[PDB]
């Protein structure tokens, strides 16, 4: 499957087995002037947010984790 992956945002073939695209956001030390960080990649299981303001969005179609 294909998902948008960071750092350089492009569609990439997921490592086989991984069929879930994800979007992960969190707050940096620069969040006041730049906003939330955002990570994009593949996964075999939708990640579980550690704690705090980490929110994770998952889907299961090609290139569904578009950049906000």
């Amino acid at each position, epitope marked *: 499957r294909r998902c948008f992956t*960071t*750092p*350089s*945002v492009r569609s990439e073939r997921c490592p086989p087995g991984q069929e879930v695209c994800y979007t992960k*956001t969190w707050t*940096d*030390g*620069h969040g006041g*002037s*730049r*906003g*939330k*960080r*955002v*990570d*994009l990649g593949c996964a075999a299981t939708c990640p579980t947010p550690k704690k705090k303001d980490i929110k994770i969005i998952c889907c299961s179609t090609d290139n569904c984790n578009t*950049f*906000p």
Partner: antibody, heavy 126, light 108 residues
Framework: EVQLVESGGGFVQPGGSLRLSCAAS????????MHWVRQSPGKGLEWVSG???????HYAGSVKGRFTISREDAKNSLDLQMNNLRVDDTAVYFC????????????????????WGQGTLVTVSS | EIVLTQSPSSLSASVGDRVTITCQAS??????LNWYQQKPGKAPKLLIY???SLESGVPSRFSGSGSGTDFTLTISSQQPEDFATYYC?????????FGQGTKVEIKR
């Protein structure tokens, strides 16, 4: 996993030259700021030069005019042509990737140095 | 050229001790300061960027503080794999500059 590999180091006499190259695993140079950082017991870690994502080159003062950093687009080769070398240039040279962090406001480059090659040894001696 | 002054250049610590490393910049650099860890024979590893933000995979015992000129790296509980040399690095203006390093050694 993402890696950087250096090549072209060795032993050279004062006034000599050396062409270091860097090859990346898992990413493309033109999307990132790339840097060369050297390390020696005596001056520590020292940023030598950088070639940002848009194609502009930058150099440290002790090296400007003698070193040339360049990129072979789509060829996976970042080079540092070091000319008129000095004993003072003896160091381990690291190929270093400038970080690329994405925010809801866009992309930001070189907040830090996240990928470091294994290093190549350069020794200038008579 | 921004000068970074790391203190101490060396320090001894036991497992479980609280380690404190400081870094002082010769001028204001906001929070554009990073911390690296380096083992002998190896390349430095990025640990903290933006003074306080950890990289992925870095244990929670590492933490950073400061903005302006005075910065701190703290290891809440020294572990065996933490005996290394630690460098601060500013990303405020050209040229990028590093501190002289703090070598954490085994106390006995």
């Amino acid at each position: 996993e993402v890696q950087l590999v250096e090549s072209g180091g060795g032993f050279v006499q004062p006034g000599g030259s050396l062409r270091l190259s860097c090859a990346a695993s898992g990413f493309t140079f033109s999307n990132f700021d790339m840097h060369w950082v050297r390390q020696s017991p005596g001056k520590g870690l020292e940023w030598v030069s950088g070639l940002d994502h848009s194609g502009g080159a930058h150099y440290a003062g002790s090296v400007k005019g003698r070193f040339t950093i360049s990129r072979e687009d789509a060829k996976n080769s970042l080079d540092l042509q070091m000319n008129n070398l000095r004993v003072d240039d003896t160091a381990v040279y690291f190929c270093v990737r400038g970080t690329l962090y994405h925010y809801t406001s866009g992309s930001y480059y070189s907040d830090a140095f996240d990928i470091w090659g294994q290093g190549t040894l350069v020794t200038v001696s008579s | 050229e921004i000068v970074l002054t790391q203190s101490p250049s060396s320090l001894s610590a036991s497992v479980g001790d609280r380690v404190t490393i400081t870094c002082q910049a010769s001028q204001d650099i906001s929070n554009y300061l990073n911390w690296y860890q380096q083992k002998p024979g190896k390349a430095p590893k990025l640990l903290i960027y933006a003074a306080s933000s950890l990289e992925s995979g870095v244990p929670s015992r590492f933490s950073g503080s400061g903005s302006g000129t005075d910065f701190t790296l703290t290891i809440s509980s020294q572990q065996p794999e933490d005996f290394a040399t630690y460098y601060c690095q500013q990303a405020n203006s050209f040229p990028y500059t590093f501190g002289q390093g703090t070598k954490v050694e085994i106390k006995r």
